[PDB]
Amino acid sequence: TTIVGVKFNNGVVIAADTRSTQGPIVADKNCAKLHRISPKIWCAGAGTAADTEAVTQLIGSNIELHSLYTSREPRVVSALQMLKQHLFKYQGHIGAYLIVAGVDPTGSHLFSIHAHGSTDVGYYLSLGSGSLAAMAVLESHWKQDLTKEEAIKLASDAIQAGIWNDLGSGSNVDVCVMEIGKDAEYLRNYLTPNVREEKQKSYKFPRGTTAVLKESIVNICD
Amino acid sequence: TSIMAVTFKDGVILGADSRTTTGAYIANRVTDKLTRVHDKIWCCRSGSAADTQAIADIVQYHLELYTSQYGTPSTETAASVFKELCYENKDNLTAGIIVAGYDDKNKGEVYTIPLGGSVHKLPYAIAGSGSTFIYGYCDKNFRENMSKEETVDFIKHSLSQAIKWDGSSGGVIRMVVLTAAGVERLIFYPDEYEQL
């Protein structure tokens, strides 16, 4: 994977590629690595696919219950604390590497969490196998005081570095923008620069090509 | 990591580099290794980032609860709570921690807690991978009851050298000043400290 987070003026943006691998094989060409913890707190996840999904849903669930209990909008630092303490308890065996971002009554926030449970704060971050390709771009183009549109470009540029230069990353770019005072906008397949070319030939077979031994109607009813 | 804490005339100063390592890759070049566990009790963290964060969070929690019931804890008490955690969980922890704080009775105090969870009260303490390279320097240049400016210079020059030789240290030099006057954060960038 490649994933990034970039702060700007009035909020924070995260992005991710969409490739899943099982060894050298591409298992999924278009999976969603951006997760909603709460409406205005989103998470990008790299590492063990099931772990990032499961840990993100669990904390998302508890955040919802907490938000209801307190009559308050959830804060990013609560997701951060709950995620990190959970991951620490599991001593690295839950292989979730996360960039957590969002807006809340306190402001806008950007964090990363490594699987053993350490957290980092920054204006720009990247994780995953493509994190060095992305970080090279971020270190080259990031500046203090980015506008929303500059931040989006920077983020997706960083993901693109991963897509092209890292064999662990490919296909599309997903983005999520969390601006203060506004709804989070989740931009699924924001960029699609890897559209399969038209195939040379149709492999649709003459009907009756396949030798059959038996047929029967299956009973799905009651 | 390179970290240190130094007592002086008016209190104590903590210092640290800002490098986090993930192999030979610098995962974070602007890390904050100087961490508050109480208004005027802070610690420098070295070793595992996850272990030291988890420890500091628990200690902060204990001291917040201590405060609620019995008022301001002493620096010695804070160091004792770190020890208890580090010692009792020595098999599962990679944490080298320096504890530093300011009382009005006791002035500045420094306690260092190496890997095994032993406690050592010292005039100053150095730790982290980069500290090996400045034992010579620090022993030769430290005096007691330095001024604030002298102590900032001592720390700046020391960590400058640790960063120069240690590949696992770098970025900015952070410092936290602890006196009766309050709490002051200092930062020094490469272009300044490198050519000292």
Binding site: H114, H116 | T1, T20, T22, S46, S48, A49, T52
Partner: peptide
């Protein structure tokens, strides 16, 4: 894993 991250070290300091």
């Amino acid at each position: 894993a991250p070290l300091x």
